[PDB]
Ligand binder design. Structure first.
Ligand SMILES: CC[C@@H]1C=C[C@H]2CCN(C(=O)[C@@H]3CC[C@H]4C=C[C@]5(CCCN5C(=O)[C@H](Cc5ccccc5Cl)NC(C)=O)C(=O)N43)[C@@H]2C(=O)N1CC(=O)O
Length: 111
């Protein structure tokens, strides 16, 4: 397989609607997702890909660039921003937040 999952964590994936200063559910679909970080070993790249638990819709698919600032705002809500959007993960548990942050931080160390 070209891409290998390095973690799976449960979270409600949010994107920030700057115009209304409000978080809104990614993909317009309230509820929780299974959120992976996938590693493409060929070029050592990483992306966050999350799918709704119910209907499998992909609600996030974003690259993790070198130098990203991953903000652990709370024990259960982490966020980061790129050139177009601000993403937030409202984790199902502190354990899920810890798993995801570990993998993210690993990725950011090896990029
Ligand atoms: C899904 C509900 C949600 C859950 C939990 C809480 C936790 C706190 N919180 C926030 O939205 C916080 C409070 C202040 C506000 C102000 C601005 C925001 C919003 C937009 C981005 N931002 C930044 O602070 C970024 C972070 C950053 C730093 C460094 C690198 C990257 C980033 Cl992204 N700052 C820049 C300058 O990039 C922000 O997160 N905000 C969440 C929240 O209240 N709710 C409840 C609701 O919304 O009802």
């Amino acid at each position: 397989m070209s891409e290998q999952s390095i973690c799976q964590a449960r979270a409600a994936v949010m994107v920030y609607d700057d115009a209304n200063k409000k978080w809104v559910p990614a993909g317009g679909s309230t509820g929780f997702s299974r959120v992976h970080i996938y590693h493409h070993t060929g070029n050592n790249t990483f992306r966050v890909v999350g799918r709704k638990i119910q209907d499998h819709q992909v609600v996030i698919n974003c690259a993790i660039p070198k130098g990203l600032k991953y903000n652990q705002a709370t024990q259960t809500f982490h966020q980061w921003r790129d050139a177009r959007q601000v993403y937030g993960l409202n984790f199902g548990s502190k354990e899920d937040a810890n798993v995801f942050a570990s993998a993210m931080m690993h990725a950011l160390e090896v990029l």
